[PDB]
PDB file of all heavy atoms in Angstrom:
ATOM      1  N   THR A   1      -1.289   5.544 -13.460  1.00 31.48           N
ATOM      2  CA  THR A   1      -2.446   5.620 -14.351  1.00 31.48           C
ATOM      3  C   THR A   1      -2.911   7.068 -14.425  1.00 31.48           C
ATOM      4  O   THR A   1      -3.613   7.577 -13.548  1.00 31.48           O
ATOM      5  CB  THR A   1      -3.568   4.706 -13.874  1.00 31.48           C
ATOM      6  OG1 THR A   1      -3.089   3.359 -13.808  1.00 31.48           O
ATOM      7  CG2 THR A   1      -4.758   4.764 -14.823  1.00 31.48           C
ATOM      8  N   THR A   2      -2.501   7.733 -15.503  1.00 32.93           N
ATOM      9  CA  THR A   2      -2.844   9.129 -15.724  1.00 32.93           C
ATOM     10  C   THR A   2      -4.339   9.281 -15.975  1.00 32.93           C
ATOM     11  O   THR A   2      -4.943   8.496 -16.711  1.00 32.93           O
ATOM     12  CB  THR A   2      -2.041   9.688 -16.897  1.00 32.93           C
ATOM     13  OG1 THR A   2      -2.290   8.897 -18.066  1.00 32.93           O
ATOM     14  CG2 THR A   2      -0.556   9.664 -16.578  1.00 32.93           C
ATOM     15  N   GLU A   3      -4.930  10.282 -15.341  1.00 32.38           N
ATOM     16  CA  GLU A   3      -6.366  10.512 -15.306  1.00 32.38           C
ATOM     17  C   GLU A   3      -6.651  11.982 -15.563  1.00 32.38           C
ATOM     18  O   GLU A   3      -5.754  12.825 -15.457  1.00 32.38           O
ATOM     19  CB  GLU A   3      -6.921  10.062 -13.944  1.00 32.38           C
ATOM     20  CG  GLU A   3      -6.961   8.557 -13.775  1.00 32.38           C
ATOM     21  CD  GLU A   3      -7.983   7.907 -14.687  1.00 32.38           C
ATOM     22  OE1 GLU A   3      -9.044   8.521 -14.930  1.00 32.38           O
ATOM     23  OE2 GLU A   3      -7.719   6.787 -15.169  1.00 32.38           O
ATOM     24  N   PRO A   4      -7.895  12.332 -15.931  1.00 33.09           N
ATOM     25  CA  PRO A   4      -8.206  13.752 -16.194  1.00 33.09           C
ATOM     26  C   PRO A   4      -8.137  14.681 -14.987  1.00 33.09           C
ATOM     27  O   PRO A   4      -8.255  15.899 -15.167  1.00 33.09           O
ATOM     28  CB  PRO A   4      -9.630  13.692 -16.760  1.00 33.09           C
ATOM     29  CG  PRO A   4      -9.731  12.362 -17.361  1.00 33.09           C
ATOM     30  CD  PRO A   4      -8.949  11.455 -16.479  1.00 33.09           C
ATOM     31  N   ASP A   5      -7.978  14.169 -13.768  1.00 35.30           N
ATOM     32  CA  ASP A   5      -7.701  15.024 -12.623  1.00 35.30           C
ATOM     33  C   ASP A   5      -6.225  15.043 -12.246  1.00 35.30           C
ATOM     34  O   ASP A   5      -5.861  15.640 -11.226  1.00 35.30           O
ATOM     35  CB  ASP A   5      -8.549  14.599 -11.424  1.00 35.30           C
ATOM     36  CG  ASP A   5     -10.001  14.967 -11.589  1.00 35.30           C
ATOM     37  OD1 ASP A   5     -10.279  15.953 -12.301  1.00 35.30           O
ATOM     38  OD2 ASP A   5     -10.862  14.282 -11.007  1.00 35.30           O
ATOM     39  N   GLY A   6      -5.365  14.423 -13.051  1.00 37.09           N
ATOM     40  CA  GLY A   6      -3.963  14.337 -12.699  1.00 37.09           C
ATOM     41  C   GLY A   6      -3.616  13.192 -11.779  1.00 37.09           C
ATOM     42  O   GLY A   6      -2.540  13.207 -11.173  1.00 37.09           O
ATOM     43  N   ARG A   7      -4.500  12.203 -11.655  1.00 37.86           N
ATOM     44  CA  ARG A   7      -4.250  11.060 -10.791  1.00 37.86           C
ATOM     45  C   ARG A   7      -3.203  10.138 -11.408  1.00 37.86           C
ATOM     46  O   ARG A   7      -2.942  10.182 -12.612  1.00 37.86           O
ATOM     47  CB  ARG A   7      -5.546  10.287 -10.559  1.00 37.86           C
ATOM     48  CG  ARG A   7      -6.600  11.049  -9.787  1.00 37.86           C
ATOM     49  CD  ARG A   7      -7.762  10.143  -9.409  1.00 37.86           C
ATOM     50  NE  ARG A   7      -8.479   9.629 -10.572  1.00 37.86           N
ATOM     51  CZ  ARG A   7      -9.496  10.250 -11.160  1.00 37.86           C
ATOM     52  NH1 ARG A   7      -9.918  11.416 -10.696  1.00 37.86           N
ATOM     53  NH2 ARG A   7     -10.089   9.704 -12.213  1.00 37.86           N
ATOM     54  N   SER A   8      -2.594   9.306 -10.560  1.00 34.38           N
ATOM     55  CA  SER A   8      -1.617   8.304 -10.989  1.00 34.38           C
ATOM     56  C   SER A   8      -1.520   7.262  -9.880  1.00 34.38           C
ATOM     57  O   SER A   8      -1.002   7.567  -8.803  1.00 34.38           O
ATOM     58  CB  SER A   8      -0.266   8.952 -11.264  1.00 34.38           C
ATOM     59  OG  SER A   8       0.279   9.512 -10.085  1.00 34.38           O
ATOM     60  N   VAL A   9      -1.995   6.039 -10.137  1.00 34.15           N
ATOM     61  CA  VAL A   9      -2.386   5.125  -9.068  1.00 34.15           C
ATOM     62  C   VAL A   9      -1.352   4.016  -8.881  1.00 34.15           C
ATOM     63  O   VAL A   9      -0.588   3.670  -9.789  1.00 34.15           O
ATOM     64  CB  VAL A   9      -3.796   4.543  -9.342  1.00 34.15           C
ATOM     65  CG1 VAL A   9      -3.757   3.489 -10.427  1.00 34.15           C
ATOM     66  CG2 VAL A   9      -4.454   4.025  -8.075  1.00 34.15           C
ATOM     67  N   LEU A  10      -1.301   3.503  -7.659  1.00 35.17           N
ATOM     68  CA  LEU A  10      -0.644   2.260  -7.296  1.00 35.17           C
ATOM     69  C   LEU A  10      -1.654   1.119  -7.187  1.00 35.17           C
ATOM     70  O   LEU A  10      -2.857   1.333  -7.016  1.00 35.17           O
ATOM     71  CB  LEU A  10       0.101   2.446  -5.970  1.00 35.17           C
ATOM     72  CG  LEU A  10      -0.678   3.064  -4.794  1.00 35.17           C
ATOM     73  CD1 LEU A  10      -1.419   2.062  -3.893  1.00 35.17           C
ATOM     74  CD2 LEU A  10       0.255   3.942  -3.974  1.00 35.17           C
ATOM     75  N   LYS A  11      -1.143  -0.109  -7.278  1.00 35.68           N
ATOM     76  CA  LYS A  11      -1.902  -1.305  -6.930  1.00 35.68           C
ATOM     77  C   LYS A  11      -0.978  -2.280  -6.212  1.00 35.68           C
ATOM     78  O   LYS A  11       0.193  -2.415  -6.580  1.00 35.68           O
ATOM     79  CB  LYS A  11      -2.548  -1.950  -8.172  1.00 35.68           C
ATOM     80  CG  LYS A  11      -1.595  -2.446  -9.253  1.00 35.68           C
ATOM     81  CD  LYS A  11      -2.361  -3.000 -10.442  1.00 35.68           C
ATOM     82  CE  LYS A  11      -1.420  -3.521 -11.516  1.00 35.68           C
ATOM     83  NZ  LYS A  11      -2.146  -4.056 -12.705  1.00 35.68           N
ATOM     84  N   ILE A  12      -1.486  -2.905  -5.146  1.00 37.82           N
ATOM     85  CA  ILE A  12      -0.765  -3.920  -4.384  1.00 37.82           C
ATOM     86  C   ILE A  12      -1.735  -5.034  -4.018  1.00 37.82           C
ATOM     87  O   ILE A  12      -2.953  -4.849  -4.003  1.00 37.82           O
ATOM     88  CB  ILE A  12      -0.103  -3.365  -3.102  1.00 37.82           C
ATOM     89  CG1 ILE A  12      -1.141  -2.682  -2.211  1.00 37.82           C
ATOM     90  CG2 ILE A  12       1.067  -2.448  -3.411  1.00 37.82           C
ATOM     91  CD1 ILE A  12      -0.607  -2.313  -0.849  1.00 37.82           C
ATOM     92  N   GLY A  13      -1.178  -6.201  -3.702  1.00 35.28           N
ATOM     93  CA  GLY A  13      -1.994  -7.282  -3.185  1.00 35.28           C
ATOM     94  C   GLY A  13      -1.404  -8.671  -3.320  1.00 35.28           C
ATOM     95  O   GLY A  13      -0.809  -9.001  -4.351  1.00 35.28           O
ATOM     96  N   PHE A  14      -1.566  -9.491  -2.280  1.00 35.63           N
ATOM     97  CA  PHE A  14      -1.206 -10.904  -2.308  1.00 35.63           C
ATOM     98  C   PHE A  14      -1.936 -11.620  -1.180  1.00 35.63           C
ATOM     99  O   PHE A  14      -2.123 -11.059  -0.097  1.00 35.63           O
ATOM    100  CB  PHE A  14       0.306 -11.127  -2.172  1.00 35.63           C
ATOM    101  CG  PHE A  14       0.712 -12.556  -2.353  1.00 35.63           C
ATOM    102  CD1 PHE A  14       0.791 -13.102  -3.622  1.00 35.63           C
ATOM    103  CD2 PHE A  14       0.979 -13.364  -1.258  1.00 35.63           C
ATOM    104  CE1 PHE A  14       1.150 -14.421  -3.802  1.00 35.63           C
ATOM    105  CE2 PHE A  14       1.332 -14.684  -1.428  1.00 35.63           C
ATOM    106  CZ  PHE A  14       1.417 -15.215  -2.704  1.00 35.63           C
ATOM    107  N   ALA A  15      -2.335 -12.866  -1.445  1.00 34.01           N
ATOM    108  CA  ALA A  15      -2.965 -13.705  -0.433  1.00 34.01           C
ATOM    109  C   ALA A  15      -2.709 -15.169  -0.753  1.00 34.01           C
ATOM    110  O   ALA A  15      -3.166 -15.675  -1.783  1.00 34.01           O
ATOM    111  CB  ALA A  15      -4.474 -13.455  -0.348  1.00 34.01           C
ATOM    112  N   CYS A  16      -1.987 -15.842   0.135  1.00 35.11           N
ATOM    113  CA  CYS A  16      -1.878 -17.290   0.100  1.00 35.11           C
ATOM    114  C   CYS A  16      -1.958 -17.872   1.505  1.00 35.11           C
ATOM    115  O   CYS A  16      -1.414 -18.952   1.750  1.00 35.11           O
ATOM    116  CB  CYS A  16      -0.569 -17.710  -0.589  1.00 35.11           C
ATOM    117  SG  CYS A  16      -0.502 -19.418  -1.217  1.00 35.11           S
ATOM    118  N   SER A  17      -2.604 -17.178   2.441  1.00 35.03           N
ATOM    119  CA  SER A  17      -2.411 -17.461   3.855  1.00 35.03           C
ATOM    120  C   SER A  17      -3.598 -17.082   4.731  1.00 35.03           C
ATOM    121  O   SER A  17      -4.725 -16.914   4.257  1.00 35.03           O
ATOM    122  CB  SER A  17      -1.158 -16.740   4.344  1.00 35.03           C
ATOM    123  OG  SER A  17      -1.311 -15.339   4.273  1.00 35.03           O
ATOM    124  N   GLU A  18      -3.319 -16.945   6.026  1.00 34.56           N
ATOM    125  CA  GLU A  18      -4.288 -16.731   7.094  1.00 34.56           C
ATOM    126  C   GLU A  18      -4.490 -15.252   7.389  1.00 34.56           C
ATOM    127  O   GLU A  18      -4.626 -14.873   8.557  1.00 34.56           O
ATOM    128  CB  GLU A  18      -3.829 -17.454   8.359  1.00 34.56           C
ATOM    129  CG  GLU A  18      -3.815 -18.966   8.220  1.00 34.56           C
ATOM    130  CD  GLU A  18      -3.230 -19.657   9.431  1.00 34.56           C
ATOM    131  OE1 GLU A  18      -2.687 -18.958  10.314  1.00 34.56           O
ATOM    132  OE2 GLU A  18      -3.314 -20.900   9.497  1.00 34.56           O
ATOM    133  N   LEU A  19      -4.480 -14.419   6.335  1.00 36.69           N
ATOM    134  CA  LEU A  19      -4.376 -12.964   6.468  1.00 36.69           C
ATOM    135  C   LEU A  19      -5.517 -12.326   7.255  1.00 36.69           C
ATOM    136  O   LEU A  19      -5.381 -11.185   7.712  1.00 36.69           O
ATOM    137  CB  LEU A  19      -4.327 -12.308   5.088  1.00 36.69           C
ATOM    138  CG  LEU A  19      -3.205 -12.550   4.083  1.00 36.69           C
ATOM    139  CD1 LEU A  19      -3.529 -11.794   2.815  1.00 36.69           C
ATOM    140  CD2 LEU A  19      -1.863 -12.123   4.614  1.00 36.69           C
ATOM    141  N   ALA A  20      -6.646 -13.024   7.404  1.00 38.71           N
ATOM    142  CA  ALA A  20      -7.772 -12.492   8.167  1.00 38.71           C
ATOM    143  C   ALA A  20      -7.408 -12.303   9.634  1.00 38.71           C
ATOM    144  O   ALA A  20      -7.806 -11.320  10.263  1.00 38.71           O
ATOM    145  CB  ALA A  20      -8.978 -13.420   8.032  1.00 38.71           C
ATOM    146  N   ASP A  21      -6.649 -13.245  10.196  1.00 36.67           N
ATOM    147  CA  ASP A  21      -6.224 -13.123  11.585  1.00 36.67           C
ATOM    148  C   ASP A  21      -4.930 -12.332  11.723  1.00 36.67           C
ATOM    149  O   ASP A  21      -4.764 -11.590  12.696  1.00 36.67           O
ATOM    150  CB  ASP A  21      -6.045 -14.509  12.209  1.00 36.67           C
ATOM    151  CG  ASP A  21      -7.350 -15.266  12.330  1.00 36.67           C
ATOM    152  OD1 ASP A  21      -8.408 -14.613  12.445  1.00 36.67           O
ATOM    153  OD2 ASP A  21      -7.314 -16.513  12.316  1.00 36.67           O
ATOM    154  N   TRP A  22      -4.013 -12.483  10.767  1.00 36.47           N
ATOM    155  CA  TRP A  22      -2.708 -11.836  10.861  1.00 36.47           C
ATOM    156  C   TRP A  22      -2.806 -10.328  10.683  1.00 36.47           C
ATOM    157  O   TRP A  22      -2.267  -9.564  11.493  1.00 36.47           O
ATOM    158  CB  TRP A  22      -1.769 -12.418   9.811  1.00 36.47           C
ATOM    159  CG  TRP A  22      -0.501 -11.652   9.668  1.00 36.47           C
ATOM    160  CD1 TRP A  22       0.554 -11.631  10.526  1.00 36.47           C
ATOM    161  CD2 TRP A  22      -0.181 -10.737   8.616  1.00 36.47           C
ATOM    162  NE1 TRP A  22       1.527 -10.784  10.056  1.00 36.47           N
ATOM    163  CE2 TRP A  22       1.096 -10.222   8.883  1.00 36.47           C
ATOM    164  CE3 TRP A  22      -0.854 -10.308   7.470  1.00 36.47           C
ATOM    165  CZ2 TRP A  22       1.721  -9.314   8.041  1.00 36.47           C
ATOM    166  CZ3 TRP A  22      -0.233  -9.406   6.635  1.00 36.47           C
ATOM    167  CH2 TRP A  22       1.036  -8.914   6.927  1.00 36.47           C
ATOM    168  N   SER A  23      -3.484  -9.878   9.623  1.00 35.45           N
ATOM    169  CA  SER A  23      -3.610  -8.444   9.378  1.00 35.45           C
ATOM    170  C   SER A  23      -4.590  -7.793  10.345  1.00 35.45           C
ATOM    171  O   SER A  23      -4.650  -6.562  10.431  1.00 35.45           O
ATOM    172  CB  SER A  23      -4.038  -8.196   7.934  1.00 35.45           C
ATOM    173  OG  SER A  23      -5.323  -8.738   7.699  1.00 35.45           O
ATOM    174  N   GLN A  24      -5.363  -8.601  11.074  1.00 35.46           N
ATOM    175  CA  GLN A  24      -6.180  -8.100  12.171  1.00 35.46           C
ATOM    176  C   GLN A  24      -5.329  -7.595  13.330  1.00 35.46           C
ATOM    177  O   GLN A  24      -5.793  -6.759  14.113  1.00 35.46           O
ATOM    178  CB  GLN A  24      -7.119  -9.219  12.639  1.00 35.46           C
ATOM    179  CG  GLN A  24      -8.208  -8.840  13.622  1.00 35.46           C
ATOM    180  CD  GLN A  24      -9.092 -10.017  13.966  1.00 35.46           C
ATOM    181  OE1 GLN A  24      -8.853 -11.138  13.518  1.00 35.46           O
ATOM    182  NE2 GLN A  24     -10.127  -9.770  14.754  1.00 35.46           N
ATOM    183  N   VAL A  25      -4.087  -8.063  13.449  1.00 34.30           N
ATOM    184  CA  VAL A  25      -3.264  -7.751  14.610  1.00 34.30           C
ATOM    185  C   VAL A  25      -2.721  -6.326  14.530  1.00 34.30           C
ATOM    186  O   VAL A  25      -3.057  -5.483  15.369  1.00 34.30           O
ATOM    187  CB  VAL A  25      -2.122  -8.775  14.755  1.00 34.30           C
ATOM    188  CG1 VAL A  25      -1.282  -8.469  15.985  1.00 34.30           C
ATOM    189  CG2 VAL A  25      -2.681 -10.189  14.827  1.00 34.30           C
ATOM    190  N   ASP A  26      -1.907  -6.028  13.505  1.00 37.38           N
ATOM    191  CA  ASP A  26      -1.118  -4.801  13.540  1.00 37.38           C
ATOM    192  C   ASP A  26      -1.092  -4.025  12.226  1.00 37.38           C
ATOM    193  O   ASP A  26      -0.037  -3.498  11.857  1.00 37.38           O
ATOM    194  CB  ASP A  26       0.329  -5.110  13.937  1.00 37.38           C
ATOM    195  CG  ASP A  26       0.464  -5.507  15.389  1.00 37.38           C
ATOM    196  OD1 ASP A  26      -0.328  -5.014  16.218  1.00 37.38           O
ATOM    197  OD2 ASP A  26       1.353  -6.328  15.701  1.00 37.38           O
ATOM    198  N   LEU A  27      -2.205  -3.937  11.500  1.00 35.71           N
ATOM    199  CA  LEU A  27      -2.200  -3.169  10.259  1.00 35.71           C
ATOM    200  C   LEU A  27      -2.590  -1.710  10.486  1.00 35.71           C
ATOM    201  O   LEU A  27      -2.591  -0.921   9.533  1.00 35.71           O
ATOM    202  CB  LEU A  27      -3.139  -3.846   9.245  1.00 35.71           C
ATOM    203  CG  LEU A  27      -3.135  -3.527   7.744  1.00 35.71           C
ATOM    204  CD1 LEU A  27      -1.839  -3.995   7.108  1.00 35.71           C
ATOM    205  CD2 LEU A  27      -4.343  -4.129   7.048  1.00 35.71           C
ATOM    206  N   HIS A  28      -2.872  -1.324  11.733  1.00 33.47           N
ATOM    207  CA  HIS A  28      -3.558  -0.060  11.981  1.00 33.47           C
ATOM    208  C   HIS A  28      -2.639   1.140  11.796  1.00 33.47           C
ATOM    209  O   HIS A  28      -3.055   2.173  11.266  1.00 33.47           O
ATOM    210  CB  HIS A  28      -4.160  -0.045  13.381  1.00 33.47           C
ATOM    211  CG  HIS A  28      -4.899   1.217  13.686  1.00 33.47           C
ATOM    212  ND1 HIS A  28      -6.106   1.531  13.099  1.00 33.47           N
ATOM    213  CD2 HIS A  28      -4.595   2.255  14.500  1.00 33.47           C
ATOM    214  CE1 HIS A  28      -6.517   2.704  13.543  1.00 33.47           C
ATOM    215  NE2 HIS A  28      -5.618   3.165  14.395  1.00 33.47           N
ATOM    216  N   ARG A  29      -1.392   1.039  12.241  1.00 33.15           N
ATOM    217  CA  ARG A  29      -0.470   2.166  12.149  1.00 33.15           C
ATOM    218  C   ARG A  29       0.772   1.758  11.391  1.00 33.15           C
ATOM    219  O   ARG A  29       1.909   2.014  11.793  1.00 33.15           O
ATOM    220  CB  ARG A  29      -0.149   2.717  13.529  1.00 33.15           C
ATOM    221  CG  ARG A  29      -1.333   3.448  14.131  1.00 33.15           C
ATOM    222  CD  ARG A  29      -1.077   3.949  15.532  1.00 33.15           C
ATOM    223  NE  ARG A  29      -2.253   4.633  16.057  1.00 33.15           N
ATOM    224  CZ  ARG A  29      -2.345   5.117  17.290  1.00 33.15           C
ATOM    225  NH1 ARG A  29      -1.327   4.986  18.128  1.00 33.15           N
ATOM    226  NH2 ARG A  29      -3.452   5.730  17.685  1.00 33.15           N
ATOM    227  N   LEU A  30       0.548   1.107  10.256  1.00 33.04           N
ATOM    228  CA  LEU A  30       1.620   0.737   9.349  1.00 33.04           C
ATOM    229  C   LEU A  30       1.973   1.950   8.497  1.00 33.04           C
ATOM    230  O   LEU A  30       1.615   2.020   7.318  1.00 33.04           O
ATOM    231  CB  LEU A  30       1.190  -0.459   8.496  1.00 33.04           C
ATOM    232  CG  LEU A  30       2.216  -1.177   7.621  1.00 33.04           C
ATOM    233  CD1 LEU A  30       3.315  -1.765   8.483  1.00 33.04           C
ATOM    234  CD2 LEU A  30       1.536  -2.262   6.807  1.00 33.04           C
ATOM    235  N   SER A  31       2.659   2.928   9.093  1.00 34.00           N
ATOM    236  CA  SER A  31       3.026   4.160   8.394  1.00 34.00           C
ATOM    237  C   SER A  31       4.192   3.849   7.459  1.00 34.00           C
ATOM    238  O   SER A  31       5.352   4.181   7.714  1.00 34.00           O
ATOM    239  CB  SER A  31       3.366   5.266   9.384  1.00 34.00           C
ATOM    240  OG  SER A  31       4.556   4.979  10.091  1.00 34.00           O
ATOM    241  N   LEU A  32       3.864   3.209   6.338  1.00 32.24           N
ATOM    242  CA  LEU A  32       4.838   2.527   5.505  1.00 32.24           C
ATOM    243  C   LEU A  32       4.928   3.236   4.160  1.00 32.24           C
ATOM    244  O   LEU A  32       3.936   3.765   3.654  1.00 32.24           O
ATOM    245  CB  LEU A  32       4.451   1.051   5.352  1.00 32.24           C
ATOM    246  CG  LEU A  32       5.430   0.068   4.733  1.00 32.24           C
ATOM    247  CD1 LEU A  32       6.705   0.076   5.530  1.00 32.24           C
ATOM    248  CD2 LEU A  32       4.811  -1.307   4.782  1.00 32.24           C
ATOM    249  N   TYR A  33       6.120   3.218   3.572  1.00 31.28           N
ATOM    250  CA  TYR A  33       6.554   4.311   2.715  1.00 31.28           C
ATOM    251  C   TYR A  33       7.169   3.777   1.430  1.00 31.28           C
ATOM    252  O   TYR A  33       7.080   2.587   1.113  1.00 31.28           O
ATOM    253  CB  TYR A  33       7.538   5.205   3.481  1.00 31.28           C
ATOM    254  CG  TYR A  33       8.734   4.468   4.074  1.00 31.28           C
ATOM    255  CD1 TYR A  33       9.898   4.253   3.336  1.00 31.28           C
ATOM    256  CD2 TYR A  33       8.695   3.988   5.379  1.00 31.28           C
ATOM    257  CE1 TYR A  33      10.980   3.587   3.883  1.00 31.28           C
ATOM    258  CE2 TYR A  33       9.772   3.316   5.929  1.00 31.28           C
ATOM    259  CZ  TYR A  33      10.911   3.121   5.175  1.00 31.28           C
ATOM    260  OH  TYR A  33      11.990   2.456   5.707  1.00 31.28           O
ATOM    261  N   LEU A  34       7.802   4.693   0.698  1.00 31.66           N
ATOM    262  CA  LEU A  34       8.453   4.414  -0.573  1.00 31.66           C
ATOM    263  C   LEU A  34       9.534   5.462  -0.799  1.00 31.66           C
ATOM    264  O   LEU A  34       9.607   6.469  -0.093  1.00 31.66           O
ATOM    265  CB  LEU A  34       7.438   4.392  -1.723  1.00 31.66           C
ATOM    266  CG  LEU A  34       6.552   5.613  -2.009  1.00 31.66           C
ATOM    267  CD1 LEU A  34       7.162   6.620  -2.992  1.00 31.66           C
ATOM    268  CD2 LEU A  34       5.182   5.150  -2.498  1.00 31.66           C
ATOM    269  N   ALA A  35      10.360   5.222  -1.815  1.00 28.85           N
ATOM    270  CA  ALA A  35      11.396   6.170  -2.202  1.00 28.85           C
ATOM    271  C   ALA A  35      11.702   6.009  -3.684  1.00 28.85           C
ATOM    272  O   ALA A  35      11.557   4.925  -4.255  1.00 28.85           O
ATOM    273  CB  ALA A  35      12.672   5.986  -1.375  1.00 28.85           C
ATOM    274  N   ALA A  36      12.133   7.104  -4.296  1.00 33.67           N
ATOM    275  CA  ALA A  36      12.495   7.159  -5.712  1.00 33.67           C
ATOM    276  C   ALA A  36      13.409   8.363  -5.903  1.00 33.67           C
ATOM    277  O   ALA A  36      13.976   8.887  -4.937  1.00 33.67           O
ATOM    278  CB  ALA A  36      11.264   7.238  -6.616  1.00 33.67           C
ATOM    279  N   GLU A  37      13.569   8.791  -7.152  1.00 32.57           N
ATOM    280  CA  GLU A  37      14.360   9.979  -7.421  1.00 32.57           C
ATOM    281  C   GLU A  37      13.552  11.243  -7.128  1.00 32.57           C
ATOM    282  O   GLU A  37      12.343  11.322  -7.367  1.00 32.57           O
ATOM    283  CB  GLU A  37      14.862   9.975  -8.859  1.00 32.57           C
ATOM    284  CG  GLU A  37      15.882   8.889  -9.106  1.00 32.57           C
ATOM    285  CD  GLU A  37      16.406   8.905 -10.519  1.00 32.57           C
ATOM    286  OE1 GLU A  37      15.885   9.697 -11.333  1.00 32.57           O
ATOM    287  OE2 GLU A  37      17.339   8.130 -10.813  1.00 32.57           O
ATOM    288  N   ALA A  38      14.263  12.249  -6.616  1.00 32.88           N
ATOM    289  CA  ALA A  38      13.720  13.455  -5.994  1.00 32.88           C
ATOM    290  C   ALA A  38      12.829  14.343  -6.871  1.00 32.88           C
ATOM    291  O   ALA A  38      11.875  14.914  -6.327  1.00 32.88           O
ATOM    292  CB  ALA A  38      14.867  14.288  -5.408  1.00 32.88           C
ATOM    293  N   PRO A  39      13.052  14.526  -8.186  1.00 30.74           N
ATOM    294  CA  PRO A  39      12.024  15.228  -8.976  1.00 30.74           C
ATOM    295  C   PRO A  39      10.738  14.440  -9.151  1.00 30.74           C
ATOM    296  O   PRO A  39       9.717  15.041  -9.507  1.00 30.74           O
ATOM    297  CB  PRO A  39      12.711  15.478 -10.324  1.00 30.74           C
ATOM    298  CG  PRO A  39      14.139  15.480 -10.020  1.00 30.74           C
ATOM    299  CD  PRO A  39      14.303  14.428  -8.972  1.00 30.74           C
ATOM    300  N   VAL A  40      10.746  13.132  -8.899  1.00 31.53           N
ATOM    301  CA  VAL A  40       9.555  12.314  -9.044  1.00 31.53           C
ATOM    302  C   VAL A  40       8.994  11.857  -7.698  1.00 31.53           C
ATOM    303  O   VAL A  40       7.779  11.953  -7.484  1.00 31.53           O
ATOM    304  CB  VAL A  40       9.849  11.102  -9.958  1.00 31.53           C
ATOM    305  CG1 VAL A  40       8.619  10.222 -10.126  1.00 31.53           C
ATOM    306  CG2 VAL A  40      10.356  11.570 -11.312  1.00 31.53           C
ATOM    307  N   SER A  41       9.841  11.384  -6.783  1.00 31.28           N
ATOM    308  CA  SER A  41       9.426  10.924  -5.462  1.00 31.28           C
ATOM    309  C   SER A  41       8.833  12.037  -4.613  1.00 31.28           C
ATOM    310  O   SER A  41       7.759  11.870  -4.030  1.00 31.28           O
ATOM    311  CB  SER A  41      10.617  10.314  -4.725  1.00 31.28           C
ATOM    312  OG  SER A  41      11.597  11.303  -4.474  1.00 31.28           O
TER     313      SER A  41
END
């Protein structure tokens, strides 16, 4: 999403479960990533 400051945003999300207790356990250091082509990634 191009913006007047040069921003470009992601969106994620899903819930069909007990996520209040599950994501309470180990979401703290989820150093989790992505990959694409090198002029863009």
Side-chain angles (χ1 to χ4, degrees):
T1 302
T2 57
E3 288 292 325
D5 287 332
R7 294 189 296 272
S8 64
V9 75
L10 50 90
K11 62 182 181 181
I12 56 171
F14 187 78
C16 200
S17 65
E18 294 174 352
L19 297 177
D21 294 332
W22 170 74
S23 64
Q24 190 178 4
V25 181
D26 289 329
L27 195 67
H28 181 71
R29 289 177 180 176
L30 190 62
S31 68
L32 191 58
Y33 54 87
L34 57 90
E37 292 181 354
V40 180
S41 65

